[PDB]
Write an enzyme that holds these catalytic residues in place. Structure first.
Site, short mmCIF file in Angstrom:
data_model
loop_
_atom_site.label_atom_id
_atom_site.label_comp_id
_atom_site.label_asym_id
_atom_site.label_seq_id
_atom_site.Cartn_x
_atom_site.Cartn_y
_atom_site.Cartn_z
N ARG B 21 0.80 -1.22 0.00
CA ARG B 21 0.00 0.00 0.00
C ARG B 21 0.84 1.28 0.00
NH1 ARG B 21 -1.74 2.85 4.20
NH2 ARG B 21 -1.20 1.25 5.77
N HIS B 51 5.35 1.41 25.73
CA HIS B 51 4.65 2.55 26.32
C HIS B 51 3.26 2.14 26.81
CE1 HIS B 51 3.19 6.91 26.19
NE2 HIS B 51 4.35 7.00 26.82
N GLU B 58 -5.61 3.52 24.84
CA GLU B 58 -6.21 3.09 23.60
C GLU B 58 -7.35 2.08 23.89
OE1 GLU B 58 -4.28 0.31 20.99
OE2 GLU B 58 -4.87 1.42 19.17
N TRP B 80 -2.55 7.49 17.07
CA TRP B 80 -3.50 7.49 15.96
C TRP B 80 -3.51 8.79 15.15
CZ3 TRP B 80 -5.54 3.73 13.39
CH2 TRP B 80 -5.65 2.46 13.99
N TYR B 94 -12.63 0.52 15.41
CA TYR B 94 -12.82 -0.45 16.47
C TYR B 94 -13.91 -0.09 17.48
CZ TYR B 94 -8.20 -1.81 14.69
OH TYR B 94 -7.12 -2.16 13.89
N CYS B 146 -7.00 -3.99 11.88
CA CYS B 146 -5.87 -4.92 11.87
C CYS B 146 -6.17 -6.09 12.80
CB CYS B 146 -4.57 -4.23 12.31
SG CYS B 146 -4.01 -2.95 11.23
N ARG B 166 -5.28 -9.72 11.01
CA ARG B 166 -5.12 -9.93 9.57
C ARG B 166 -3.85 -9.30 9.01
NH1 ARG B 166 -4.88 -5.17 6.49
NH2 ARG B 166 -5.62 -3.58 7.91
N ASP B 169 2.26 -5.48 11.96
CA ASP B 169 3.56 -4.82 11.98
C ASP B 169 4.28 -5.41 13.19
OD1 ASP B 169 5.63 -3.04 12.66
OD2 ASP B 169 4.51 -1.28 11.90
N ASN B 177 -0.54 -4.82 20.49
CA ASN B 177 -1.71 -5.67 20.32
C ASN B 177 -1.74 -6.80 21.35
OD1 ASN B 177 -1.21 -5.09 16.88
ND2 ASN B 177 -3.13 -4.53 17.91
N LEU B 208 7.69 -7.46 8.78
CA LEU B 208 8.62 -6.45 9.24
C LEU B 208 8.79 -5.41 8.14
CD1 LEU B 208 11.35 -8.80 10.77
CD2 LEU B 208 9.98 -7.11 12.02
N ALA B 263 4.79 3.49 9.21
CA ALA B 263 4.46 3.62 7.79
C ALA B 263 3.01 4.07 7.68
CB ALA B 263 4.64 2.30 7.08
C1 LIG Z 1 -0.93 -1.89 17.53
C2 LIG Z 1 -1.24 -0.75 17.74
C3 LIG Z 1 -1.70 0.64 18.03
N1 LIG Z 1 -1.25 1.62 17.04
C4 LIG Z 1 -2.22 1.91 15.98
C5 LIG Z 1 -1.51 1.77 14.65
C6 LIG Z 1 -1.95 2.50 13.56
C7 LIG Z 1 -1.30 2.42 12.34
C8 LIG Z 1 -0.18 1.62 12.20
N2 LIG Z 1 0.47 1.56 10.98
C9 LIG Z 1 1.59 0.79 10.83
N3 LIG Z 1 2.23 0.76 9.67
N4 LIG Z 1 2.06 0.03 11.89
C10 LIG Z 1 1.42 0.05 13.11
O1 LIG Z 1 1.66 -0.88 13.88
C11 LIG Z 1 0.28 0.85 13.27
C12 LIG Z 1 -0.39 0.94 14.50
C13 LIG Z 1 0.07 2.15 17.15
C14 LIG Z 1 0.58 3.11 16.28
C15 LIG Z 1 1.87 3.60 16.44
C16 LIG Z 1 2.67 3.14 17.48
C17 LIG Z 1 4.05 3.68 17.67
O2 LIG Z 1 4.55 4.50 16.78
N5 LIG Z 1 4.71 3.34 18.77
C18 LIG Z 1 6.04 3.84 19.04
C19 LIG Z 1 5.98 5.15 19.83
C20 LIG Z 1 4.99 5.08 20.99
C21 LIG Z 1 4.86 6.45 21.63
O3 LIG Z 1 4.02 7.28 21.22
O4 LIG Z 1 5.61 6.76 22.58
C22 LIG Z 1 6.83 2.82 19.81
O5 LIG Z 1 8.06 2.96 19.94
O6 LIG Z 1 6.25 1.83 20.32
C23 LIG Z 1 2.15 2.20 18.35
C24 LIG Z 1 0.87 1.70 18.19
C1 LIG Z 2 -2.51 -1.86 12.25
C2 LIG Z 2 -3.07 -1.46 13.62
C3 LIG Z 2 -2.80 -2.49 14.67
O1 LIG Z 2 -3.47 -2.46 15.70
N1 LIG Z 2 -1.81 -3.37 14.49
C4 LIG Z 2 -1.00 -3.38 13.43
O2 LIG Z 2 0.00 -4.07 13.42
N2 LIG Z 2 -1.28 -2.61 12.40
C5 LIG Z 2 -0.34 -2.46 11.28
C6 LIG Z 2 -0.37 -3.59 10.25
C7 LIG Z 2 0.16 -2.87 9.02
O3 LIG Z 2 1.59 -2.69 9.13
C8 LIG Z 2 -0.48 -1.52 9.12
C9 LIG Z 2 -1.85 -1.48 8.45
O4 LIG Z 2 -1.67 -1.41 7.03
P1 LIG Z 2 -2.62 -2.31 6.08
O5 LIG Z 2 -4.05 -1.89 6.35
O6 LIG Z 2 -2.37 -3.76 6.46
O7 LIG Z 2 -2.09 -1.96 4.71
O8 LIG Z 2 -0.62 -1.28 10.52
#
Ligand SMILES: C#CCN(Cc1ccc2[nH]c(N)nc(=O)c2c1)c1ccc(C(=O)N[C@@H](CCC(=O)O)C(=O)O)cc1
Ligand SMILES: *[C@H]1CC(=O)NC(=O)N1[C@H]1C[C@H](O)[C@@H](COP(=O)(O)O)O1
Ligand SMILES: C#CCN(Cc1ccc2[nH]c(N)nc(=O)c2c1)c1ccc(C(=O)N[C@@H](CCC(=O)O)C(=O)O)cc1
Ligand SMILES: *[C@H]1CC(=O)NC(=O)N1[C@H]1C[C@H](O)[C@@H](COP(=O)(O)O)O1
Lengths: 264, 264
Positions: B21, B51, B58, B80, B94, B146, B166, B169, B177, B208, B263
């Site tokens: 994507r 963290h 969340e 977010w 969610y 996700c 599904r 990351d 998670n 990854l 990303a």
């Molecule tokens: C799963 C989930 C929830 N989410 C929701 C969420 C939304 C879009 C996503 N998009 C992608 N590509 N990967 C993710 O895992 C992801 C997660 C998260 C999003 C970001 C971080 C993050 O950047 N954590 C950093 C900094 C944390 C902080 O703010 O201090 C870290 O080092 O852990 C964690 C969870």
């Molecule tokens: C999404 C949010 C979450 O709670 N856990 C994740 O690991 N998430 C990651 C998975 C992908 O890296 C990205 C979502 O992108 P796609 O919708 O799968 O293209 O966030």
């Protein structure tokens, strides 16, 4: 099959006795995963004779979006009889959700067409999903979806699929579910010009009915035979245009059938 | 954690390169499962500091049925930010599906209330499920769910939960998670007078990101430490009445935090 017999033995070794909605009782574990590389052969259980005819017709029926048993009866398939109403209706079960999931704003989503288009145009998408678990229509269904949620994946020119099966009757249901999804992968792969990858089966409440134990142990005494091979004899113009006669299973040499009663 | 690091190493060893994507690229595998016995300890990754403030807020936000980031900002949580619109909205993600899944005919189902009532009245049910995968609302969501589908299970007085994720990351998302769902199991178990069982994690496209490789190699060079213990310091009136201050993680002794870009 090796993976299938290992699951049976795991339920027997690790399961807990539980009561259930039918009053029959199960032995259950929670959470399992296994994989079938479809290039090794078609994963139809060989340690008892399974009814491939019913499996194929049921899948064609799902793919048409049908939820009435009339079509199954036209083809002498009786596996859904116990749950249908007086008119043959099951409510908005698998076929309906697969082909026409109703939205809150009056739309219907054809999830099968959606996934075929994703596989053709965006196979690295992480969202290639079909769900039968339509929360808002569960109360209209004769039975809640067992094979609830599935996802496709493409790598190295091969199509894989993972199913989440929230409830699994290991003796009666699971052989059908595995073969059904394996067939669907072959059909989808054909339509998308892909080779076949893995079918990954994931279980939730994974159980043996209490009145299937003698049957299960009889089956466990038997050695799996070589997997049969699936031959598709035509490429239809769409995933919805297959016929029963387009499929042949070769080299299926199962041990004798083992009868067991279904819990209603 | 042992199983987490094993998965990381597996993606490195067996993952295939994908163009996704976002254009960033990943290494990916398909289909994996891990099991955390919650009586062994709270499954918070120790090979980097995670963290907990963001994880807890969340989850509380989800349980409120909230899909606007204002609540997160009030509590200095920014996870977010990248996907919200100018008004802070993410669409019917969610929290909305958990608390108010819309039926096609204008009603709603509160899936969390349903689950609590099933655990209290019908704990042997094979249908104790929450789905965020509302096919009919995906196009309104900022990001597709996700952590898509989860199921509860009761045996021998213990509550277990399985999540189907599904898309995962592995570096950034997965530690959150796992901790999130583990916390939810503890909260639900408390509200239903149960002990905690297992959290079973099942992944689909498990990857990854290409720009997390240095971070992954760093983390894999570290040995895990004993898991911490979750303490809940007061029992609220319901599953919807928890607050951040109710939770204490005791004996959490992680390696230093590791920073990496998300990303979008
Ligand atoms: C799963 C989930 C929830 N989410 C929701 C969420 C939304 C879009 C996503 N998009 C992608 N590509 N990967 C993710 O895992 C992801 C997660 C998260 C999003 C970001 C971080 C993050 O950047 N954590 C950093 C900094 C944390 C902080 O703010 O201090 C870290 O080092 O852990 C964690 C969870
Ligand atoms: C999404 C949010 C979450 O709670 N856990 C994740 O690991 N998430 C990651 C998975 C992908 O890296 C990205 C979502 O992108 P796609 O919708 O799968 O293209 O966030
Ligand atoms: C999964 C699935 C599809 N289904 C749908 C379906 C509906 C309700 C269920 N209910 C229960 N308790 N278990 C099931 O597995 C089950 C399966 C099946 C239903 C019955 C049989 C069955 O009785 N098979 C027997 C006889 C087959 C035949 O007609 O010749 C067998 O010996 O295999 C198979 C599949
Ligand atoms: C249901 C239909 C299917 O395709 N496979 C199964 O294995 N199915 C089994 C699972 C249960 O034994 C029973 C359904 O009952 P619950 O809805 O789980 O109470 O059928």
């Amino acid at each position: 099959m090796k993976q299938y017999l290992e699951l049976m033995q795991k339920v027997l070794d690790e399961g807990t006795q539980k009561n259930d909605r039918t009053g029959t009782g199960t032995l259950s574990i929670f959470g399992h995963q296994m994989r079938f590389n479809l290039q090794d052969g078609f994963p139809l259980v060989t340690t008892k004779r399974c009814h491939l005819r019913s499996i194929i017709h049921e899948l064609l029926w799902f793919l048409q979006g049908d939820t009435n048993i009339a079509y199954l009866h036209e083809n002498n398939v009786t596996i859904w009889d116990e749950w249908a109403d007086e008119n043959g209706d099951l409510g908005p079960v698998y076929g309906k959700q697969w082909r026409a999931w109703p939205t809150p704003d009056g739309r219907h989503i054809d999830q099968i067409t959606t996934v075929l288009n994703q596989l053709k145009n965006d196979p690295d998408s992480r969202r290639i999903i079909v769900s039968a678990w339509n929360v808002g229509e569960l109360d209209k269904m004769a039975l809640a979806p067992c094979h609830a949620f599935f996802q496709f994946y493409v790598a190295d020119g091969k199509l894989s699929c993972q199913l989440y099966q929230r409830s699994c009757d290991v003796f009666l249901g699971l052989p059908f579910n595995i073969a059904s999804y394996a067939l669907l992968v072959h059909m989808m792969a054909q339509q998308c010009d892909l080779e076949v990858g893995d079918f990954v089966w994931t279980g939730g409440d994974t159980h043996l009915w209490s009145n299937h134990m003698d049957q299960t142990h009889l089956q466990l005494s038997r050695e799996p035979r070589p997997l049969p091979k699936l031959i598709i004899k035509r490429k239809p113009e769409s995933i919805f245009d297959y016929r029963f006669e387009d499929f042949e299973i070769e080299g299926y040499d199962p041990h004798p059938g083992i009868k067991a009663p279904v819990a209603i």
